[PDB]
Amino acid sequence: REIITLQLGQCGNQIGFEFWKQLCAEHGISPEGIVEEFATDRKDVFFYQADDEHYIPRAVLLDLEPRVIHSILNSPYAKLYNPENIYLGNNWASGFSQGEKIHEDIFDIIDREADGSDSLEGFVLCHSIAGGTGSGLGSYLLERLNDRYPKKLVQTYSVFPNQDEDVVVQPYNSLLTLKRLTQNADCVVVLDNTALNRIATDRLHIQNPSFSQINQLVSTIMSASTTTLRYPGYMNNDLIGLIASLIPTPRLHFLMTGYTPLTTDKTTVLDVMRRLLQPKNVMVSTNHCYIAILNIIQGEVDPTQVHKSLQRIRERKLANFIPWGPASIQVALSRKSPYLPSAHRVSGLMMANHTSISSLFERTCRQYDKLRKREAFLEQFRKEDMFKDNFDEMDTSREIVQQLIDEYHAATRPDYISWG
Template identity: 65%
Template sequence: MSGGVMESVARPPPGVAVGGGGGATGQKAKERCEYHFQMPLHYPSKEGILEDFATQGGDRKDVFFYQADDQHYVPRALLMDLEPRVINGIQNSEYQNLYNPENVFIANHGGGAGNNWASGYHQRASNVVVELARFPQFKMFAPGQQFKVFRVFITLWERILGKQYEEDLMDMIDREADGSDSLEGFVLCHSIAGGTGSGMGSYLLETLNDRYSKKLVQTYSVFPNQNETSDVVVQPYNSLLTLKRLTLNADCVVVLDNTSLNRIAVERLHITNPSFTQTNSLVSTVMSASTTTLRYPGYMNNDLVGLLASLIPTPRCHFLMTGYTPLTVERHASVIRKTTVLDVMRRLLQTKNIMVSSCARTKEASQAKYISILNIIQGEVDPTQVHESLQRIRERKLVNFIEWGPASIQVALSRKSPYVQTAHRVSGLMLASHTGIRHLFSKCLSQYEKLRKRQAFLDNYRNHPMFADNDLSEFDESRDIIESLVDEYKACESPDYIKWGMEDPDHVLTGEGSASGTVDPKLTV
């Protein structure tokens, strides 16, 4: 999107949803992140036909839709998965006539990635090796020779089929990008724990960053629940390998932590056993609210660059945590309090409303600081109320900011959607960069180290060329990058962060950009 005013004809980024359902833990149920969550489907019907009452809404329907030749609205979204179950469910649902079938990718083998990052990265069927082992001719080989045959077969499979899939994926992305008047970037929805969302998502991040190097790449990334035992035993491996790509190849990552989402559902919404639908509802609330200023634009924060530029002062610290209030699962939930701007902004700063579990009540976590904050306030709000609320928050010292940057809360005002009835007069979303998020990454590293120390489940990865001949350098490099990321977030808490990384080059992360406090040129406005 190039324009900065309401009359701009610029187009926001296409959405890419990667991964599907699967796995007893339900992590992959989050991978689907059906993009219609983010789109205001209250004004086009479920077949994309604009309702009469929606013609005077004053919103920009072209943000997440385009009009086909027959004038019905089509989501500007791509759905990609290596197994058909979830996408088939969407195509057989009430939204079956909404999506462009040319923007749906399902691997021909339909075998999924088997919760294996490497399988998803190479778009390989997880059941190919199993099928190969059933051939009588294969059993004639000695065990050592069987492993070599596996390697040769998989390499040939990935080169032939992987190339075909790469061309199909890029054709879909290029076609959607070419249909934009002024492409600004891409939005990727995925999980980091399973196989497709993590592996295929990583592949797309690298490809988009290389193919569209000057365009923004924003992700909504679902992190696994780290307080419960997962059926995906290689979850720490998948998370670590994906975190490397999120660090090096994404411009903004909105972290959606399943640990915190479940806690909020239990403690704040009083749901004993939250279902996937209910936690998905929390995710959809964040995604919808974060795009409000794009769909109902004003004079500021009406494009993706303007929205993110002030939130990400340094290129590597681009992981954002969110908070939302008031939270309700049911749209017409009973109202028990009067919402005001001060009440909303104060609650957004409370740990119990933050959707990242890194803000633990520990001594070390209490020293964490905000790098930047943007509050998106929806409703009929007087700007003077915002000024008074900010002054009250400052007087009460409710926020602990870094010392080397501007210590202020930015506020974007947006009117509420006229198509959705809500029980509250004022609601708010907080997008924040916070040094405490490093504790979430440290947990991922800790879980990885426990598995790696036992050399557990590594054979699942050695079957792929990237890890062939027992080459595990990809794991080591990913660990080093995440450790450097944790160190940088910790360094942000010191007043002399601007000088950090200049004296010791080992602290600077590998890849493009620097860690010395420079602003990503793609976020310059």
């Protein structure tokens, strides 16, 4: 069915706008919005279709004190959207309280596109973790759309703040938002700034204007992850069947992402599979290993070569991973997109459950604990104190993510007959 996307945060609104620019380049529309007669493709799961010849993308545009949204206005894509949902803090708790006081009218904006379409499948949350304006508010609406509708699917697009230590309040914020993503979202697509910055410094020569480049990298990822849904495949071409294969344990819903062209600014399948398994073509940063991998192909692919290629990785002993179930590596095939200039014809995807990211989590679980011993880096905001007078909800969230780390460490081994 149809999928509604919601973007908040300034960085989130930017990457949502660039994503819709990428899809306007993808789909049979002009940059004004008007249909082009050159075109197979479906424009229904992400675009509301009138006959106003300007098919409006199904995006909910919310903000706090619009600054970059003015720059979103000065563009030729100002005729692509106008659903009139633009409305005028610093912490998780302050942003949570500010989202608390105005919940009725933003939820009326949600109920508007809920009543606008008749079929409903999923909500994509475009959000940055511990981002200030995004944090608190995004966790609040995440709690509310899961509590209000238990029949739909919740997916999130999320980057990870990592700068190798400055914001001293970030481990509290990420800790609480990770609790809310684990208990109020069914699947989370995890990215970080650091690995994409590393790959960007690898391909280009960039130090200062990194943001403008990594946005392009992210948008290529999010378009690629939706090519199997927008163009009709037969495997996991709905969101529900896609997420139903990727979760072996209901606490594990974090998906690793890669992309086989590391630079785009002939091939057989075993080549791109082996290039795919390398950690440098991976976009997300003791024995730590995958539980189950799904890889998705896009290009001119002969069908018998994929069988030989999977046989090749079986013979390589590149499978030095060992979970406790026979749920295995997964191949899928979709077409490369027509209708646009398409360089580097065959390109790959991976969607995998990897426990190396738990190290990333425990770094936050390290940092907050140190600040919890010092008690000088909570910054003592007034709404933060009124919202929780004892600050034991952060301690309870630390307990939940500690159980999450123990369940990860049990999921690494082939011994999960007992709970971890």
